[PDB]
Write a protein that binds this ligand. Sequence first.
Ligand SMILES: CCCCCCCCCCCCO[C@@H]1O[C@H](CO)[C@@H](O[C@H]2O[C@H](CO)[C@@H](O)[C@H](O)[C@H]2O)[C@H](O)[C@H]1O
Ligand SMILES: CCCCCCCCCCCCO[C@@H]1O[C@H](CO)[C@@H](O[C@H]2O[C@H](CO)[C@@H](O)[C@H](O)[C@H]2O)[C@H](O)[C@H]1O
Lengths: 156, 1033, 48
Amino acid sequence: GSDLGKKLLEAARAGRDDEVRILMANGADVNAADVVGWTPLHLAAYWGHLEIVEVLLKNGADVNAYDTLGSTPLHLAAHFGHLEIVEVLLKNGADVNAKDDNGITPLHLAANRGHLEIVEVLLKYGADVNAQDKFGKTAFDISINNGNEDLAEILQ
Amino acid sequence: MPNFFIDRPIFAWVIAIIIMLAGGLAILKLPVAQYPTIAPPAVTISASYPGADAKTVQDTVTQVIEQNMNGIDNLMYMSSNSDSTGTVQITLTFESGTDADIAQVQVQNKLQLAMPLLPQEVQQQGVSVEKSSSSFLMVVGVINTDGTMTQEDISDYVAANMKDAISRTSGVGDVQLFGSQYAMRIWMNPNELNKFQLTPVDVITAIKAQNAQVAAGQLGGTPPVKGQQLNASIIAQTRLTSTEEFGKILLKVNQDGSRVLLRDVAKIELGGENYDIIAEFNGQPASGLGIKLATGANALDTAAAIRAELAKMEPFFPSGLKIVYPYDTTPFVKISIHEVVKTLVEAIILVFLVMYLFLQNFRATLIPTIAVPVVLLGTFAVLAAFGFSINTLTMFGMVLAIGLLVDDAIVVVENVERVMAEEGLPPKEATRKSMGQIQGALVGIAMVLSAVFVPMAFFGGSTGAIYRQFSITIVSAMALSVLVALILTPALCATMLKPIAKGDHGEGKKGFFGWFNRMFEKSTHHYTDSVGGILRSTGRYLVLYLIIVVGMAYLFVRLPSSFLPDEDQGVFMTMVQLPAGATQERTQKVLNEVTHYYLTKEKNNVESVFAVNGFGFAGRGQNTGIAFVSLKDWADRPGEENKVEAITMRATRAFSQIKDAMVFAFNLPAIVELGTATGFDFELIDQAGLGHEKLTQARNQLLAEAAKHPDMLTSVRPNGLEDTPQFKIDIDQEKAQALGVSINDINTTLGAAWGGSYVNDFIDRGRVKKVYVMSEAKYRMLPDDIGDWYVRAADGQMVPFSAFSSSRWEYGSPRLERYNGLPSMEILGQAAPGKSTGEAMELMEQLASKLPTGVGYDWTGMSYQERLSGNQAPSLYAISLIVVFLCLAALYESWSIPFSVMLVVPLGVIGALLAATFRGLTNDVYFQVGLLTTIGLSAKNAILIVEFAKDLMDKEGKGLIEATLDAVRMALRPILMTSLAFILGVMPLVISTGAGSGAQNAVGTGVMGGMVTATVLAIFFVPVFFVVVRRRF
Amino acid sequence: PGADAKTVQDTVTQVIEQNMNGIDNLMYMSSNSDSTGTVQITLTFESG
Ligand SMILES: CCCCCCCCCCCCO[C@@H]1O[C@H](CO)[C@@H](O[C@H]2O[C@H](CO)[C@@H](O)[C@H](O)[C@H]2O)[C@H](O)[C@H]1O
Ligand SMILES: CCCCCCCCCCCCO[C@@H]1O[C@H](CO)[C@@H](O[C@H]2O[C@H](CO)[C@@H](O)[C@H](O)[C@H]2O)[C@H](O)[C@H]1O
């Protein structure tokens, strides 16, 4: 964990595009990570900062970095409903079917929060619709427990 | 009245003596404290929820209490924070003048009725209601120096053997322990537990069963069968008392008949109730007591009594235990009382010297000497009557007041001496005439200062509390000064003064004095000649005067405004803040650096560093700490290099280099009770149901806009804490139900192990104490440790926590704030240099108005007070101007002549401003106290002259110029004597360093500079004022 | 209920008494704790 790295982790979280731009010019570690293993790309994906996601990816950020519980930026973007960010990540190679330590996928997470467009985008990019978490649940299972009829039909 | 007492000098003495006795009595009965009550009454509700995160606290405790704070009288506002240490504090602030006891009981009663809506474990910990707006008399640290006791050992000792006896000490109003008494600590081992198919639930159950008080009854109890011989209480099970007993608690009997004891699945020891704070005193384990003054007590008595008690405990101290005093406000009271005596003595000396220099006889010299103690004692009596205390502010008013009593005495004696030398009249009839000449001037000066200071007492809130202390000392002193001058001093003049031959101005005397008289009599002629020439050309002097008034306005508006000047109070703070998620150990490393810095590179100034790890003022947690730095006495720290500002400067500059930590020294607020009256204090409010994340976004939006006006807004920042990573764990209900694992077993196992659980009480050496279960440290550190905890299913199988849960990282708040019952975020900031806080507040309101829908705001604290203080000021100044005018109009029987006096006010004010600006001081309350006294004093010179001149025209038919010239001729000496005495007396205030030298320098330079220009300008300008006013009208 | 004098003194009476510091005008305080578990603490104040 380096100094400019720390500054990058904060700037990304805080969505300060300009500061991030300058930091990129100065070579701030795009692979910096906090104690729980979040990279600036995790932070931007979490808090929804679209431009910074794009800029980080231009500058070599690991699109498939995982935190200490195995969660990726795609996990975070899908869970918190950041549609344009989910599409950018997938275009830049994000593992559509990445499982975290619990066997949970971006699809599980999107389905659980009722993010219809995101579910569709994840299916478009090849998300495994039959993927089971550590409890053997699918995104369909999650849909019907939640009583989400729209989403339930999407997953047929 | 003067004629009455001139013939009755013994009656006069009797009144003087009764006044002296009244005052003497008052001094015996008067409370003695550092400060009056200044802050508005506040009541804090405090509750603790072991193992709870900020939101759990807020949503099961804080909100419920808040929804019940209804039907309480005189509430101004309510605020709270809920944090992830498991703590809530709700602080209710009441109108100034509210009875603090009634406010507290009203709050406690509303709480008591919400208690059944709180979580069981919070009801168990209890919810404390306390007066919050009180401050510490002193802090007693207790350390151990032979490395034999930990801070828990010390705290338990203090609580068992010192606390109660300090509370019982005379004058002590409240005592807080820094730490806890011991608690019985059970540190569970998940491996051992699982080995015997046990869970934390079994541990808690067994403890409740086998450490308990069981009622039983009596043998031969009523109603008995008759004939019964014995009545006796049955004693059954009573609480456990030792670690061995808890160790031997039976948990399980196996099949092979062997026994599983508590000590077989747990470490057992006496420990602390919590471990959130590490306190060290110069690197050594430390506890301590924070002590407050009882209402109406004597701070000095109490401090001596506290020390006396500590001494008699010292023979029973364990080895290495030592008492230490890192904070003691008692010096300040001591110094202030000394200052008053010191000023009293040197003023008596100064008046002696000045009277003798000019009047050249000891008898004349005695009369003012007798007057001062009389008037000063009476002031104490009045002070007592109106329910004030002896405190730093009132004592400060006393030292100023002494400078003003002086004049009445001098003016009376000098005028009698003049009248004798000029008319040859004998002492008695010289005195009768002389009093008729100065009576009204004496009353008028008292009236003008009253009309100025009394309205200042009616400022509300904090400002009015400070002013009041000066208002009542200065004005009482004034009333009594006039009273004594109309009763005792004329009696003394007529009886003690020796006759003077007509035309005996001592010009024929010998050596120095004969020289001085000839020198002075000639100077007076040069003086009056000047005035005559001036009066032949008033036009240019009106122009000159406009230049001054214009200058005054310029200087006033460009003088920076503050509320209270920083003081060197012999202690200061060092903040330590590490990044989010930083651990207790890392913070301790930084604090050790800080401590090392001061005990090394500040060895000549620093007495001690008390490092508190885990404490902040605006957010707790493992990543914040504070170092309290205590200094050697000011005397041992010569020069500005060694005062708090300099030391702080170098500490901060040295600490800039430090790692990943923000570390910087900073001074106390001038009045710690009042607590920082700098800048503004703004509340951003969730007015719909936007929620925490949305409120953060608006906060950030507002903070962005503010930072774009460096010209108007500076250092505009959150008072609270940013969101941090938190480990979110989800229990799968279905899998729990399928394995037959109860949700209650799951949640008890997790909470008790990782959070700790208060089980019940035991009794340790005769004192009741808490029993806590919790995991040993090494089984609750990391996410991997989670799967080491097993819960027992209905079917007796042990199930790993990993089988029915899943987890992920997320952000959330470590400290949630609320204002008046709604989600809030407090923002601090201040006006840019050159700008008024008023201006800066307006821009904030302007920026706040562009925020997203549903975000509101409110002003709190100092801002709330200022918003209502500044709204009061014009009407109060207006009343003062009107009453000053009306008294002079009555004094002169004229609607116009009061202007000739009133015009002198800028002559004094310009000096005050000049001295302030030159010395680089600011417009704070002490400077404002200085201006006010500067008004009264410039008015004094003017009133003397205008009175002589008007009386000369009315009674002796003299022309306008003839009277004016004779008036300033007569007024010159008493104006010069009273100014020389005042200027010399007030000088210590000007040059003083350390120990309240802030306030002193502020009042001193204003008051001295003001007196210099007022007397240097008045003696030429008020003849002009009188002449053109009488000419125009 | 059921507590003895020593038990009720240790867990009730001293607990309450340790909080009765710095009440205005307090002249003295007396208490008893007895074998039926009842505690009485009486505080007497200056005459005015
Ligand atoms: C010989 C010496 C005698 C000295 C006597 C001094 C008397 C002082 C009396 C002050 C009494 C209160 O004086 C003051 O009253 C005014 C008007 O009612 C109030 O002022 C109120 O009215 C003004 C003008 O309408 C508003 O702009 C202001 O927002 C509002 O607060 C003040 O809040 C109160 O402090
Ligand atoms: C205790 C502190 C003492 C500090 C004293 C320091 C010096 C202060 C000087 C005060 C000014 C007095 O100055 C006084 O001015 C007036 C003019 O206005 C002069 O008056 C003379 O000149 C003017 C202008 O030509 C004529 O109109 C006037 O008829 C003439 O007599 C006086 O000769 C002079 O004495």
